[PDB]
Design a protein around this nucleic acid. Sequence first.
DNA 1: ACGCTAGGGATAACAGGGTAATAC
DNA 2: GTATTACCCTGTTATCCCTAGCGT
Length: 223
Amino acid sequence: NIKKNQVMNLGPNSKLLKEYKSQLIELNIEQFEAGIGLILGDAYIRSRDEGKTYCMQFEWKNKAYMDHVCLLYDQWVLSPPHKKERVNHLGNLVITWGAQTFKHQAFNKLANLFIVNNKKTIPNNLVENYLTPMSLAYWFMDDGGKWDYNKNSTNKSIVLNTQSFTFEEVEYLVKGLRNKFQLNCYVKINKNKPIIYIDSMSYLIFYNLIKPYLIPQMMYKLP
DNA sequence: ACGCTAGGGATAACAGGGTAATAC
DNA sequence: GTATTACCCTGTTATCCCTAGCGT
Ligand SMILES: [Ca+2]
Ligand SMILES: [Ca+2]
Ligand SMILES: [Ca+2]
């Protein structure tokens, strides 16, 4: 049995690396469920071959969250996060962190739920059949935000920024969320694009569901 | 008086492409 | 040389986040 330690620095097309990879078969329950929320939120699952293998690429401003996701996918992530320092078209420095897993057939199970012709889509029962409290918690740390950011406000309404999805797609998600978690949420608009509004009346319900998984440095997103 | 929104800004994300390091 | 592929890099906005001033 080869250990990550032994291959995390060898060339990409390295034999020992591939041997290490062959030792891995599937993603554990945690990596799968969290992945459903990550793909619905800020992650990117792609294939460079023709759907034979997929890998996941990450990028966030918050490094702690980044480190937390890498640890989650430890076995599939050979390197530490990498600082990316870029300059705007406004001459400003923008700092973020990047990371990725290597490609592996283990990721095909996640990818085939969303990808179709290398194009991302949300299927009609994704929520009902795969979205768990853990998935939802990650989807929240990703796309999640407050409805009212004003100070001293008591509004407990949550928002999921799903601006890249179609209205049909957002409808599948909303149906699943309402039926499965009794959440009182629905579609609203932002920059002419669909977002999911969760009424403050469902806050406590929403919170108890994702509480077990949000990390401390992400708590600031809650009301 | 003040809880709430819709309008909108400079990112903080997503998508793909290019290549240095192994194999044969 | 050609085939592989993890780790960067670059092209680009739909993102989360804010707040002027609207509604009651
Ligand atoms: Ca997102
Ligand atoms: Ca995010
Ligand atoms: Ca985006």
